[PDB]
Design a binder for this molecule. Sequence first.
Ligand SMILES: CCCCCCCCCCCCCCCCCC(=O)OC[C@H](COP(=O)(O)OCCN)OC(=O)CCCCCCCCCCCCCCCCC
Lengths: 97, 49, 48
Amino acid sequence: LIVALTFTPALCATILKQHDPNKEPSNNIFARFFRSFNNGFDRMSHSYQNGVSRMLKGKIFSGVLYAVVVALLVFLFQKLPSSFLPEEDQGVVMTLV
Amino acid sequence: MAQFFIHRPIFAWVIALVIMLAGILTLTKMPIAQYPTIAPPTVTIAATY
Amino acid sequence: LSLEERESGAQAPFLYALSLLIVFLCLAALYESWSIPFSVLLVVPLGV
Ligand SMILES: CCCCCCCCCCCCCCCCCC(=O)OC[C@H](COP(=O)(O)OCCN)OC(=O)CCCCCCCCCCCCCCCCC
């Protein structure tokens, strides 16, 4: 938190350069890989928003999914076996005779 | 405060450098273990008849 | 003291350099410039 409030505002003020106008289009193989990724994430965000709306209007579906997750969480916490600290290969063996 | 450093980038650079310098110096004399000191005390008594 | 003697001497110079670097950094922060602190550091011999 201290760094975010002191160091990073300074670097944002000094290292970033101002050029987002209409003047500059650019074509590069790397550039294509980022434009596609941005389009994909835009699609993802639209789908997320639509799903949020459809979960809002459907209370039964939401509550049921929620209940199911909680039940599986309880069951799994019962089923998982326990231990203290994992066993390692420390390269020595002791025999008792 | 953020506004304060937006205009004194050299001062922020100095703060960062001082922090880093303290830690680099700290590591040179830091102990290295596998775990911290964790075993409890054990006193044993011995006697013969 | 003979056993102690060996360790004491060697470390001393390094701390002067360490001090000098920190003084420069604090001066640079004070003056908001990496240049001016030199004008201050240069007077160090005058004292000695
Ligand atoms: C995409 C690229 C990004 C890459 C970023 C790089 C990583 C940044 C994170 C740096 C933090 C490193 C932390 C190191 C912890 C190591 C833990 C350890 O096991 O210690 C071993 C050792 C201490 O024991 P010993 O072997 O006795 O050595 C001391 C005497 N020589 O340790 C030692 O020998 C002493 C170690 C001193 C620490 C050196 C720190 C290096 C800092 C590099 C940062 C540079 C950042 C650029 C700054 C811009 C400046 C304008």
